[PDB]
Amino acid sequence: SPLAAYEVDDSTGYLTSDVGGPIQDQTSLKAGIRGPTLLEDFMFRQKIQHFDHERVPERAVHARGAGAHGTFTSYADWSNITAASFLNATGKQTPVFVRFSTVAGSRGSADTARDVHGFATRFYTDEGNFDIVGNNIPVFFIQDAIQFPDLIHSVKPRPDNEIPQAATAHDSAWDFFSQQPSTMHTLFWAMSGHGIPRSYRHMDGFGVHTFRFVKDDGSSKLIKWHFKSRQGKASLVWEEAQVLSGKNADFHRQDLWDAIESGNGPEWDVCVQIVDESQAQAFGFDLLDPTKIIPFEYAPLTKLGLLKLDRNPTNYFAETEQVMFQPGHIVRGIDFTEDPLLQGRLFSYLDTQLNRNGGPNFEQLPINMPRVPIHNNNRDGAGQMFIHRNKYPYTPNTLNSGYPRQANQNAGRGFFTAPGRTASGALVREVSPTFNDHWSQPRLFFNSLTPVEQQFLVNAMRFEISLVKSEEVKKNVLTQLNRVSHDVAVRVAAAIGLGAPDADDTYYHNNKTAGVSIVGSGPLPTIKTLRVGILATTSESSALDQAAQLRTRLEKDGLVVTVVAETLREGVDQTYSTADATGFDGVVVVDGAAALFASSPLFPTGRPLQIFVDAYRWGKPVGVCGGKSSEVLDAADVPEDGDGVYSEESVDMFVEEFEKGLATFRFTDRFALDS
Amino acid sequence: SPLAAYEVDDSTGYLTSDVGGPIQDQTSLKAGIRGPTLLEDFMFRQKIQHFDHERVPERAVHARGAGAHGTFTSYADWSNITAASFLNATGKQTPVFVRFSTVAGSRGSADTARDVHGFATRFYTDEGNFDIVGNNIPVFFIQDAIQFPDLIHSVKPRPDNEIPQAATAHDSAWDFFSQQPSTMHTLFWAMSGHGIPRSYRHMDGFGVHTFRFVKDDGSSKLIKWHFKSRQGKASLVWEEAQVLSGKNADFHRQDLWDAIESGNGPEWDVCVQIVDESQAQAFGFDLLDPTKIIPFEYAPLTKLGLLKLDRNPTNYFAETEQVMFQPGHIVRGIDFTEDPLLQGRLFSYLDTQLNRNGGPNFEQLPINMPRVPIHNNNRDGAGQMFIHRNKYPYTPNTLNSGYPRQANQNAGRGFFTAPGRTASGALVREVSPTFNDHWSQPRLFFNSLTPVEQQFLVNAMRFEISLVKSEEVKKNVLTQLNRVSHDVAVRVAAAIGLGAPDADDTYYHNNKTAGVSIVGSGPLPTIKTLRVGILATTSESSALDQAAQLRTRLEKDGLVVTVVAETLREGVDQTYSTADATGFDGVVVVDGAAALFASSPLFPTGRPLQIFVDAYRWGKPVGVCGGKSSEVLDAADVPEDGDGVYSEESVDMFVEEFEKGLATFRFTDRFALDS
Numbered sequence A, B: 001s002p003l004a005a006y007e008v009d010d011s012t013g014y015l016t017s018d019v020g021g022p023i024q025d026q027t028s029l030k031a032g033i034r035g036p037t038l039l040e041d042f043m044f045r046q047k048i049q050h051f052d053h054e055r056v057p058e059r060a061v062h063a064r065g066a067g068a069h070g071t072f073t074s075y076a077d078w079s080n081i082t083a084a085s086f087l088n089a090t091g092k093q094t095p096v097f098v099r100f101s102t103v104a105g106s107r108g109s110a111d112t113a114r115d116v117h118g119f120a121t122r123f124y125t126d127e128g129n130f131d132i133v134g135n136n137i138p139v140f141f142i143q144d145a146i147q148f149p150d151l152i153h154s155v156k157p158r159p160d161n162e163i164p165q166a167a168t169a170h171d172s173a174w175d176f177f178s179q180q181p182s183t184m185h186t187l188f189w190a191m192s193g194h195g196i197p198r199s200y201r202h203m204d205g206f207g208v209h210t211f212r213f214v215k216d217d218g219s220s221k222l223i224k225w226h227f228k229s230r231q232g233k234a235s236l237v238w239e240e241a242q243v244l245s246g247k248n249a250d251f252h253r254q255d256l257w258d259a260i261e262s263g264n265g266p267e268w269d270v271c272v273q274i275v276d277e278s279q280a281q282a283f284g285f286d287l288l289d290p291t292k293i294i295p296f297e298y299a300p301l302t303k304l305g306l307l308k309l310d311r312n313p314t315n316y317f318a319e320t321e322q323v324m325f326q327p328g329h330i331v332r333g334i335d336f337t338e339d340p341l342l343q344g345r346l347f348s349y350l351d352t353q354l355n356r357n358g359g360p361n362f363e364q365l366p367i368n369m370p371r372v373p374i375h376n377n378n379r380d381g382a383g384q385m386f387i388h389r390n391k392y393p394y395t396p397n398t399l400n401s402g403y404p405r406q407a408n409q410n411a412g413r414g415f416f417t418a419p420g421r422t423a424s425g426a427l428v429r430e431v432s433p434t435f436n437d438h439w440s441q442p443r444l445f446f447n448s449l450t451p452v453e454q455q456f457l458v459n460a461m462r463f464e465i466s467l468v469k470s471e472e473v474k475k476n477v478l479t480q481l482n483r484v485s486h487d488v489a490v491r492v493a494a495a496i497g498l499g500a501p502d503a504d505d506t507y508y509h510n511n512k513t514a515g516v517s518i519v520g521s522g523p524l525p526t527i528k529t530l531r532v533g534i535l536a537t538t539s540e541s542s543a544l545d546q547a548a549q550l551r552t553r554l555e556k557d558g559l560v561v562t563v564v565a566e567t568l569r570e571g572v573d574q575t576y577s578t579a580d581a582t583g584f585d586g587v588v589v590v591d592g593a594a595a596l597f598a599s600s601p602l603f604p605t606g607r608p609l610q611i612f613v614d615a616y617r618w619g620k621p622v623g624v625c626g627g628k629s630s631e632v633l634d635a636a637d638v639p640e641d642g643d644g645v646y647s648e649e650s651v652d653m654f655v656e657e658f659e660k661g662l663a664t665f666r667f668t669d670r671f672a673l674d675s
C-alpha cells in the first residue's frame, strides 16, 4: 500500500531532472567542440552527484542477503494464548517481507560461504509492524549482547589486511571459540550442513530467544519461534559450496527469485513451543540462555499459520537493501524476556539504522512504513517527508484537545509489559551460574546426527582448524572440542598432527533429540524447482531428440531442465563452456553423446565428463539414458549398480527412477568414514 | 612508520572508554543476576554504538581492492620537461600509497572476477599530494564522463534482483556495449588476459588520459602515464579464475601482502610517452579521446623513476578503505587536457568523498593528510580536527597581514593552468567528429595477440554472450563485433547459434603494435614468489624426505613451497582437503606418493590427482620427481614428452628444468584452436 504510491514508471516519456525539467544526459556542455567542460552544466552535475552518492553503508552483520514479499495467514483465533491482532482470526492475512542472509561476509561475498544465516520476517499487521529477526540455527554463539563486537571482530577478516572474506577458517575466529566456550553449540550447528544450506527455501527460521505471549487479561507464557520449511531441509557438501562460491556467488538469491517467478513461492509453517513461566528452569537449563534449545521431546510444536513468499521486489536497493528490521518492532500480545542477548539487541537495531539511513526518519522509507495510521509527536529530523497538522506536539496539552491519547493495557490497544514480570537483587555485571553448561547441548546435537553427518562435521572442523597458523590456538580448540566429545577431538586432532587431550567426561552423555538432523529428515516432500542438467551434443541428431524427450517428461513434474551442448541452438539452454555440476541437483547424459566423455576449442578439456564425475562425487543422482552405455559410466568410474546411479533405455522408466533420486537428494554411501 | 604519529598501541594496559575511564566490557549491568539490562549501562552502549556504526559506504566503483605503502625514486632531474618537485633530482624519494582494485564488484566480491582493474597511486610530495588514478588497461569504455552512470548501471547487477555480482556476463552490459560502440576497445582488453591478471604485481598501470607536463617557463607537452611491471605480465585462464573466485576470494590481496612481508615488494618503472602539442591529431586519432592508445612505435617510453611497494598497512579500514584519491590532487608542473572523460572526473572524486566520509574534513584522515604544512581559510565542518589560530580567515585582509599569501606562476610555487591553453567556439553539447572511429584500435589490439591469445579472447566472448537471454541483444552484439573483425564475429556467432552478419570492411586492417600481448611478452624476468605445490604422503617416510629435499632446493631460489599431504605434521604445510591447483603456479608429485593417484575420509575422492590434472589443463608446469613417473602421468593422461611436463630422478636436474617452466609460466600448446 505505501509501496504503491511510490512506484515510478519510465517506460515512456522524455528524460527529466529530478525537478521535472526535460533534459539530455549523454554529452557534456563544453567551451568549443574540443573544449573543457563548463561548470554551468547542471545536467552533468545532478546526474554525477546522484551516482557519486548511490552507495550506503552495508549492514554491520548480515550484509549479504536477499528478500521477497509475501503473505502470512493465521490458521486459527489464537486469543486464548496471545492478544496479538495478526493471530486473532482463522484466515486472517497479513502482508510480509522477508530477508535472508549470511552473517560475516560483506556485500558481494558468496551466498554459499559456510556461515550462520539470517531469516528476518516483517509482519505489517493492523496493530503495527512486527519483526521476527531470526537465524536458520536455533542457538547463538554468546550469552550477553555486550560480547557481540568481540564475536564479530573475531570471525570477520583480520583487520590489518582484511583476509579472509566470509569464513571462520582463520586463527582469530578459533581463538575466540576456544576462549569463549558458550560458542560450542552454535559452532557445531555451523559446521554441520546447517552452515551450507541448499537454498533459503530449504532451511528453517528460529527466533532463537525465548519470548512471551501475553493475553488481554495480563497472563503470559514463554515461547520459541520456529519457521518450518514445507520444501524440506537440505544442504550442499562443502567441496560443492566452494566451487559454487566462484561459479555463482548469487546462487541462493537466484534460486529464491526463480522459484517465485515460476509460481513455486516457498512456504513455512510458523510455529511455537509454548511453556508456562514456572518452566523457565525446569528442563535442566535456563530459558533466558540463548545457547540452548528446548528439545522436541520436551515441548511440541504448535502450528500458528502459513508464511508464503510469492512476489519479488521491483527495486532491490529501495526494498531489499533499505529494509530496516528491529526486535523493537513489537506489538501488543508479545513481550521480551530477560535474555541478556535479546535485551542488548533492542538498543542495537534502533541505533544502527542511523548509520545506514544517515538520518532519523528511516521508518518513512516505503518498505519500513506501516499499513496503519501514525499518530505521534516525533518531529523534524533530516529527510522529514511528513507535513504534520498538529501544531501542539506535546503531552499533556489542551491546545490539541489531549491528542494523541496515551495507549496502554486499558486504552487504545496499547503495548504493555507483561504485568507478572519483576526484578530483584543487586545491580550486577555477573553471569548467572545457570548459564555455565556450555558442552551438554553441543553433545546432544552431535549425538542426533547420522554417522555420515557426524563425519561431515568432523571434516568441516578438520578443514578450518588445519588453516589455523597458531599451534596454541589449535591445542586450545582441541581442549574445548574434547569437553563435548573425546571422539571428535581425536578425529580432528588426527588431521592437524596433534594429540587430543585425555577424555574429560563431565558433560558426556548419549541422549539424542529429533528434528536437528538434515541427513536423517527423510526425502524432500517436493522436487519442484530442483535442477536437472542434461548433457547432450550437436554432433548426433539423436542426442538432441533424446534430450527433448527427457525435457518434456521432467518439466511435466516442475523440474528446471537445462540441456547442455557444445553450442547454442533450438532446444539447448547452455554451452559446456558455461556449465558446471554446481548448477544441477541431478545430471543425465544422453547415450548419443557418449563420444564427448573421453578436446574442443569451444570448452575446456574434459568438461563434459568432469560435470558427471563432480555430480557423482558430490552425492547427486546421475545417470545415462539410452540403454547400451556401460560407456560413459565406465569412463567416469561410476558403478552401474551404485545407489543413485541410473541406466535405462526407456525414457519413462529412467525418469521415474531418477525422480525418486532427486527426492532422496544426496547419496551419502559415496563418502568415506573414519575407523 | 609513515603514519606513526597516529598509531595506538594496545599491547599493554587496562580497558578504557574512549574518554580514558577504566571499564569492563564482558557482562551487561542488570537488575539482579537473571534480570533485565539497565539503560544506565554506559559501558554497553558506547561499545555497541561504536559497533553499530563501524561501516561506511563502499566506493561507488572499485569497491573491492587492497593497498600498500612504499617509495618512488626519480631516476633524473626532469625540470627540463616538468616543474614537478617530486621529479626534480636524481635519487629524490617521495612516499607513496597504492590501492589496486576491480571495478564492478562490491567490497566482499572475488579478486579474480573478469574486470577492468584499478591502479591508484598517491605521491605525498614536498609540494602537496599528487594522485594518478589509473587502470591496468590503457583505454576506457566511454568518451564523456556524463555517460559513466550509464556504463556502470549496465555492468553492475540488474537492479530488480541485484544479479549478477562482479560480472559483465548479463543482458544489460552487452546491450550497452552493442549500443555504445566506443566500448569496443576496452571490451577487447577486458576479454583478453588483461581482464584476469595473475596478480596486482603482474599487471601494468595507465593514466589512460592524455595529461600535460608544464615547465617553470609556461611551455607544455602532452603525456601518457605508463607504470611498467618489473615482475612481468601474466594472466590466469578463465576456468582457473572461476575456481579461484570460490577457493580464495582474497587471492590478489593475499599475494600482494605475502610478497611485501617476504622482502619481495613489487616494483614498477614509472614512464611517460611525451609528444608536442602540435601532435594532438597527428597519429590518425585525437589525443583527447580516451578510447585510443598511442602505439608504442609512434612514441617511445621515457622511464622517470622507480615505484616500489614495501610496507603493508597496520589497519586496513583506517588506511586502505579510507584512502580517498582524486585526480584533482595535482601539483605544479602537471595540468589537465580537454578530455571530456577526464574533465568530468575532476568533479566526481571531490564530491563522492562527502558520501564516504559523511563530512567535509576527509583530507584530515591520516592516510589523506599531506606531508607538508597546510595554510588556508577553510574552516569548521563536521569532524574538524584542527584548531586554527588565524582569526581573520578571509582575503584580502590587513588584520592577518595579508596571510596566507596568494600562490601562482610567479610566486609561492603556485599551481598554474598551462598558459598556452585556449578555448574557441560555441558552447556545445556535441561530440567531436575526431572521436568517431570506434573500431580500428580494437582491431589493432586483436591483430597484436598470438593465435592462442586470440582464441582465449574469442572464448571469453563466447562464454559471456552465450549467457545473454535476449536474441536481439546478441544480434546487436554480433553487428558491433563484426565491425572490428568478421572472423571474430563468425567464431563468437558459432557458440550462440546465430549467423554472423556479412563482412563490413570499413575499419579492417592488419597493423599490429608491440607490448599489449601477455602471451607474447616472453618468459617472466623473475620467478621469486611463485608458488610450487609438492604433493606427498605420510604413508611413505621416503615421500616426506623427497618433499623436504625439494623444499630446500626450491626455497633457495625464492619460491614459495607448499608440501601437501593427507594430514599435518612437521614439514607439511597443507592437507589435501584444503589444497587446490589454483593455489600453485607449478605442481610436483614426489614418486613415493604414486599410490595416492588412483579414497580417504580426510579429503574428497580423487583430490590428489584432481590437483595435478587441473594444473596440467590450466597450462602450468607439472612433474614427477624420483624417476618413477609413468603411474602418475598415465592416471593424469599427461604425456611424458609434453612441453612443461618434467620427469627426473635427480632433484637438482628436476628443479633446473622446472624453474625454466615457471618462467615460461603457461604452456599454451595445451589449448585447442578454432579451424
Ligand code: HDD
Pocket (backbone or CB within 6 Å): A059, A060, A061, A062, A065, A099, A100, A101, A117, A118, A119, A120, A133, A134, A135, A140, A144, A145, A146, A148, A206, A207, A208, A209, A290, A323, A324, A325, A341, A342, A344, A345, A348, A349, A352, B048, B052
Ligand atoms: C548487540 C548487537 C547484536 C546482537 C547480540 C545480535 N545482533 Fe543481529 N544485528 C545487529 C546486531 C545484533 C545489528 C547491527 O543491529 C544489525 C545489522 C543491521 C541491522 O539492521 O541490525 C543486525 C542484523 C541482523 C539480521 C539481518 C536482518 C536483515 O536482513 O536486514 C538478522 C537476521 C539478525 N541480526 C539476527 C540476529 C539473531 C538471531 C541474533 C541472536 C539471537 C542476533 N541477531 C544478535
Ligand code: HDD
Pocket (backbone or CB within 6 Å): A048, A052, B059, B060, B061, B062, B065, B099, B100, B101, B117, B118, B119, B120, B133, B134, B135, B140, B144, B145, B146, B148, B207, B208, B209, B290, B323, B324, B325, B341, B344, B345, B348, B349, B352, B353
Ligand atoms: C564521472 C565519473 C567517473 C569517471 C568517468 C571515472 N571515474 Fe574512477 N571513480 C569515480 C568516478 C569516475 C568515483 C565515483 O568518484 C570514485 C569512486 C570512489 C572514489 O574515491 O572515486 C572512482 C573510483 C576509481 C578508482 C578507485 C581508486 C581507489 O582505489 O580508491 C580507480 C582506480 C578509478 N576510479 C579509475 C578511473 C579511470 C582510469 C577512469 C577513466 C579513464 C575513471 N576512473 C573514470
Ligand SMILES: [Ca+2]
Pocket (backbone or CB within 6 Å): A158, A170, A171, A172, A173
Ligand atoms: Ca586471523
Ligand SMILES: [Ca+2]
Pocket (backbone or CB within 6 Å): A192, A193, A194, A235, A236, A453, A456, A518, A519
Ligand atoms: Ca549435510
Ligand SMILES: [Ca+2]
Pocket (backbone or CB within 6 Å): A358, A359, B358
Ligand atoms: Ca550523515
Ligand SMILES: [Ca+2]
Pocket (backbone or CB within 6 Å): A415, A416, A417
Ligand atoms: Ca507497561
Ligand SMILES: [Ca+2]
Pocket (backbone or CB within 6 Å): B158, B170, B171, B172, B173
Ligand atoms: Ca541484466
Ligand SMILES: [Ca+2]
Pocket (backbone or CB within 6 Å): B192, B193, B194, B235, B236, B453, B456, B518, B519
Ligand atoms: Ca592470456
